[PDB]
Amino acid sequence: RLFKEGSDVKAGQQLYQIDPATYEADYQSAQANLASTQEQAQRYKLLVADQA
Amino acid sequence: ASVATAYLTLKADQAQLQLTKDTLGTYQKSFDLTQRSYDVGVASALDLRQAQT
């Protein structure tokens, strides 16, 4: 818990960390898939201009 | 007969040389496309070699 109790807080201020440890893993998997497909899309964007 | 066959053979081989020049132009365009595709990184070196051959 990272707020002092009984105080005023603004919107968007973090309150607790709930130990992700699974969402971090699937986020790493999704980013690993993204790192392949975005450079494939960029290479196809470069090659589609010359009609290769 | 000999002069006639020689003239017709030359007349055939002129257009055949034109078509072989068309083939060379087509293959040069294909090799340039595969060279672009190899420089970008989609194809391997082996497709470039097998187009050059």
Swiss-Prot record, chain B:
Disruption phenotype: Disruption of MexA, MexB and OprM significantly reduces active efflux of N-(3-oxododecanoyl) homoserine lactone/3-oxo-C12-HSL/PAI-1, but not N-butyryl homoserine lactone/C4-HSL/PAI-2. It is found in: Cell outer membrane. Changing G41A: Abolishes complex formation. Induction: By growth under severe iron limitation. The outer membrane component of the MexAB-OprM efflux system that confers multidrug resistance. Functions as the major efflux pump for n-hexane and p-xylene efflux. Has been shown in one study to be involved in the active efflux of the autoinducer N-(3-oxododecanoyl) homoserine lactone, thereby playing an indirect role in quorum-sensing; but has been shown in another study not to be involved in efflux of this autoinducer. Over-expression of the pump increases antibiotic and solvent efflux capacities. Component of the MexAB-OprM multidrug efflux complex, composed of six MexA subunits forming a hexameric tube, binding to a MexB trimer, which interact with the trimeric OprM outer membrane channel protein. The OprM homotrimer forms a 135 Angstroms-long pore. It consists of a beta-barrel, which is probably inserted in the outer membrane, and an alpha-barrel formed by alpha-helices which probably spans the periplasm. In the ground state the periplasmic end is closed, while the outer membrane end opening is 6-8 Angstroms in diameter. Belongs to the outer membrane factor (OMF) (TC 1.B.17) family. This is Outer membrane protein OprM. The gene is oprM. The chain holds residues 176 to 228 of 485 of the full protein.
